Design a binder for these strands. Structure first.
Ligand code: MG
Ligand code: MG
Ligand code: MG
Ligand code: MG
Ligand code: MG
Ligand code: MG
Ligand code: MG
Lengths: 670, 666
DNA sequence: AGCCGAGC
DNA sequence: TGCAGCTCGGCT
DNA sequence: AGCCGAGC
DNA sequence: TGCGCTCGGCT
């Protein structure tokens, strides 16, 4: 038997023949990996080794629908290539005679996503053909052109065999991949995180499924949470944070192609993932249609998608441009960078563990994410309302309760109970034959509403016709129907009949807290308070830092001024002096080694800050100017010392709100 | 499928329906946006991928198999060979007119032209009715519809002749004359000054801009061997001055931004890959390093990995071949107030000969084989001695075969095959541009297996290739081998190809398209231009160094007058200080003055000096520098343009020796 | 017939 | 150059 | 049966 | 993340 219509397959010469069971099918992570495999195999390896590329994550078949399984091209391909049959037991050696390959060798990256693909493959075989696992059917090929041919030359040293040892293996695979084991996964990972937290306060040819799951796969499951579940502190996941770190570092004054920003992100922040994901991340950060970001930190310069299709209509990343919103540094003040813990990716200083915005951005833009064991969902909240609650809390008052609020949404959001809301579009009777629809509940996209609600109504039919007068950012359907049917529709709820009400429930506000511990939050009030205490504490740190730095700068200017004054008075001379004598003399005269440099180190004597000044410095205008700068620096440190951390916070909030007013006014004009 | 059929298309209102053919899917979208909801009844929208098949002389199989043209036919409701003279015929159409919507640019005009060509060839009768129109360049464009809609008009036989001029494979010589007239006429005005549309006017006033623009991007300059895209790539690499490798995809984005490259980035990335390739048959000297899988001789480079995952940077040879100092002599172009790449670089040897400049434009094409870098350097040295250059044969780096002149601009290129024993031959080289996998599939496989139309010649063969070498061991019967020898082993095994170079067409340094009969002619024209630029370089250096000398002299003078108390600046006002410097005869910034001439008194170069400048060691350092620079002016003055060139040649060869030996060791 | 390569 | 299979949990 | 989005 | 055409000279 041969294999007809599977173009990406490189079948082993002996596959499906007398030597079937001695043949190996190598499944690879992507087409590029397939090429490496083909190269390492050479012409000789072409006999007993087949190679077939997987796109990426494969169907989790354990509880997938029959339809999804039967229609999955990749899984059907694997079945055809190997000669598998659903429902068959491969206990005998007799039963094995019907397979074209005797084993499958998984060849993925040696990273967490690689492991996930191995697990999904294991899950597929375990679910459908557990009998196979008892014959050592699954293997893997581990890696760290020429290197490829060397890896395969030493094929055996890179080859690990999966081993079934008993029901612990079944339990482990089920734990990782069963839809019924979510709770178990939470516990599984809770122990892992705590166990790892502890260790951090201090310091086989045959791999069993149980060990693969509990020692290798769990690493993917944890990293999945770490990349998918936002920080409470800045509302970001790491990818998004790398994006912002990069934009800040680049500090572009004009628009930049999304694809080049992405390239720049990969370079500057050690982002190690595919560029599709990064470009989508960037597009998502920029979106500003109703139901997306309340405050987009990046500007959508071009088509970044619309409410018509929920943003799915974004032009491609090569044809669109972005840059920071003017609001971005107001929300994430540069001076505060000095207080952050910047991470290192192999001797590169990359993004911080978190930013510390002036308001809880995790509330502003709807922190959302799906991990393993947990997911997070938060609705959007109003920026000004949040600003007002911070002010209240700064005055020791109580923060008012907050309802979700979506920028430019014209509809209604009503609290039903704790974390439960009814979100309603807008519909009104124009005359006895006409209703008009002018808003859709949040996250209901215009085209989707048209197709799933109006079309079915039109074609037992309920309406006679409808017409559209949407703009890019607004919704307007005019619907005609018979008096009788309108009266009936109207008798029942109009909002009900036209499906203009949806429920929003938020019982999974799961976030990483400031220590990087996964935590469940019951109310946004709890989130606000925890943010508030950390942020207030950080304004305290900002003040100490600024007092120290401005103080060093003041001392620096004092010494520079003193030197200039003495120079122009004859009190000191440097002309034709040795460098040694010059240093020695400055010491003896009590000049101080670079105060700013000394202060940074604190977190021989150095007089460069004085001697690097230009000859221009000795001139009238510059002497006066230096004196003014010295005095202003003195007043600056003094004024700062008098202020409270609360005052600084309030200054930032006012600066932010003023620009938010300007920015949002300009958007309504535009 | 990608089609958005007009509601009324097919019905009684067919002939009142317009099919909008757009340039690419993105454009389609902006058409659907600008169209609905009312527009949806009488307008269809379908996207073309890009350039369409030229059907005029395409084979029947090619036409019949073209998905795009079949889709158009079905959508419109067209039928081959059906005349459309009357009104009884026009009834079978699903759309009454086609509206072409392309970029307002030269490639857009080419697509317009190819669509026209399509209709004119198959249904000229449809053109007499006014079937084709165009939309000139969103919901606002469509509201102002008629002001953007232009209709093509058939006017007479001169319309036929123009479409045929442009698109018939039989009218090449005519296109040459066509374009020659155009280039000459535009060259004339360059010295002086500056709704319906006939097909003759479209072709002769619009399409011809694509045809000329096609030559300017496809046919290299004699001066540097580059086309403009390649040149933009080197310009950007030189400006970036990368010391570590950069992703190709990112370099491309960078080139688009820094050099105003206005095309899809796919083409750009392939250009970059092409510049870095270093397998046998590609570049004798790759100016970019292929860090990663840039392709091999196994598949003639088609096996390169995605630009997303490969890296590059300048070869160390790049700035030896294109010295930075010469940047000062070039003419940099402007694209909307941004200074971008020069009209040409001026390398130290004729790079056009080294890496085998080739391209296909309209009317003409260019093909040059590779020539040996050292032979060229030697010939340059000979011409500097006043001697004639020796004739040169094409030469491909690392190629182990032979290239022998057969006639003028015609060569036999032969691989290597040797009889080992009476059953065995060994093949250790394939002719230049014969790729290993292709040779295996089209020559050895058929020899082993036979075909429907040929017998088997060999009994077996084994491969012992490395990534850069070829080794086939072939088994045959004594009888078969004897036959093959008798017929010529190289001939039988397809190890000889012909290389014919009668289309050495280049732009000269004035920007005029020229045909060169011999490479010696290219070498000579290059030589005169490069020699005179070494003249310009020397003039430039004497000036620049002179100014730097005067500069240091003034700085040194001021520092000495200061540490001697002959001059004080302490607490003097700016005005009094400047006025004073003038009166002591200090010179306004000489270097800035010099760059100014090349196309209030400024003493910042003195007063911006740091206070350190007044100290002992610094006074001594400044004096040495002044004196050294004075000697520099004189050292350079003693050098002729030809001396300068010879230093460059020497520095280049030294690094070339080092680079190529490193390559053999790896 | 199809390569070569800068474009769509 | 425009695509879009899948995972993972909560929610509908 | 399918969205949300950072991943393959 | 990978992935059919033009134009001219020639094989
Ligand atoms: Mg990976
Ligand atoms: Mg969001
Ligand atoms: Mg264009
Ligand atoms: Mg070449
Ligand atoms: Mg699900
Ligand atoms: Mg062309
Ligand atoms: Mg042809």
């Amino acid at each position: 038997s041969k294999i007809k219509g599977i173009p990406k397959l490189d079948d082993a010469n002996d596959a499906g023949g007398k030597h079937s069971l001695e043949c190996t099918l190598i499944l690879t992570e992507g087409d590029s990996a397939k090429s490496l495999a083909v190269s390492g195999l050479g012409v000789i390896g072409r006999d007993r080794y087949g190679v077939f590329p997987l796109r990426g994550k494969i169907l989790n078949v354990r509880e997938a629908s029959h339809k999804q399984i039967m229609e999955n091209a990749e899984i059907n391909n694997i079945i055809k290539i190997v000669g598998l049959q659903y429902k068959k037991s491969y206990d005998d050696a007799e039963s094995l005679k019907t397979l074209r390959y005797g084993k499958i060798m998984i060849m993925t990256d040696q990273d967490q996503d690689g492991s996930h693909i191995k697990g999904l493959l294991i899950n597929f075989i375990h679910h459908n053909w557990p009998s196979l696992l008892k014959h050592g059917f699954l293997e893997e090929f581990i890696t760290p052109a020429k290197e490829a041919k060397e890896y395969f030359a030493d094929m055996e040293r890179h080859r690990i065999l999966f081993r079934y040892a008993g029901p612990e293996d079944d339990a482990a695979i089920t734990l990782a991949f069963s839809k019924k084991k979510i709770d178990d996964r939470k516990e599984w990972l809770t122990n892992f995180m705590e166990d790892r937290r502890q260790r951090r306060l201090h310091g086989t040819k045959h791999l069993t499924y149980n060990d693969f799951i509990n020692k290798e796969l769990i690493l993917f499951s944890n990293s999945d949470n770490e990349r998918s579940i936002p920080s409470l502190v800045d509302g970001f996941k790491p990818g998004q944070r790398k994006v912002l770190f990069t934009c800040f570092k680049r500090n572009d004054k004009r628009e930049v192609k999304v694809a080049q920003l992405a390239g720049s992100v990969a370079e500057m922040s050690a982002y190690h993932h595919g560029e599709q994901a990064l470009m989508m991340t960037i597009v998502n950060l920029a979106q500003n249609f109703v139901g997306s970001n309340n405050i987009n930190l990046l500007q959508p310069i071009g088509q970044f998608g619309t409410r018509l299709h929920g943003g799915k209509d974004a032009a491609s990343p090569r044809y669109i441009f972005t840059m920071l919103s003017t609001l971005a540094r107001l929300l994430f003040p540069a001076v505060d960078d000095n207080l952050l813990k910047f991470l290192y990716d192999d001797n590169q200083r990359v993004e911080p563990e978190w930013y510390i915005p002036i308001i809880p951005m995790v509330l502003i833009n709807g922190a959302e994410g799906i991990g393993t064991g947990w997911a997070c969902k938060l609705p959007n909240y109003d920026a000004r309302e949040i600003v007002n609650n911070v002010r209240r809390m700064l005055d020791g008052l109580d923060p008012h309760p907050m309802l979700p609020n979506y920028k430019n949404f014209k509809g209604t959001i009503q609290e039903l109970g704790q974390n439960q809301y009814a979100v309603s579009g807008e519909i009104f009777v124009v005359d006895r034959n006409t209703v008009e629809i002018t808003e859709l509940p949040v996250r209901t996209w215009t085209q989707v509403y048209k197709e799933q609600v109006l079309e079915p109504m039109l074609n037992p039919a309920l309406i006679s016709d409808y017409k559209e007068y949407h703009t890019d950012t607004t919704v307007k359907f005019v619907v005609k129907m018979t008096e009788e049917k309108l009266a009936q529709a109207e008798a029942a709820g109009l909002h009900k009949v036209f499906k203009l009400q949806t429920t929003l429930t938020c019982n999974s506000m799961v976030l990483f807290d400031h220590m990087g511990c996964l935590k469940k939050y019951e109310t946004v009030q709890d989130i606000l308070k925890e943010f508030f205490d950390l942020r207030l504490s950080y304004y305290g740190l900002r003040k100490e830092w600024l007092v120290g730095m401005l103080g060093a700068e003041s001392t620096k200017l004092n010494n520079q001024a003193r030197f200039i004054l003495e120079k122009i008075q004859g009190k000191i001379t440097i002309e034709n002096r040795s460098k040694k004598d010059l240093i020695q003399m400055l010491v003896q005269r009590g000049y101080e080694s670079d105060p700013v440099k000394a202060w940074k180190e604190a977190q021989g004597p150095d007089f460069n800050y004085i001697l690097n000044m230009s000859l221009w410095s000795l001139t009238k205008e510059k002497v006066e100017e230096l004196i003014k700068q010295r005095d202003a620096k003195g007043r600056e440190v003094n004024d700062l010392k008098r202020k409270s951390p609360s005052d600084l916070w309030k200054e930032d909030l006012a600066a932010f709100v003023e620009e938010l007013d300007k920015v949002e006014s300009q958007e309504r004009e535009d």
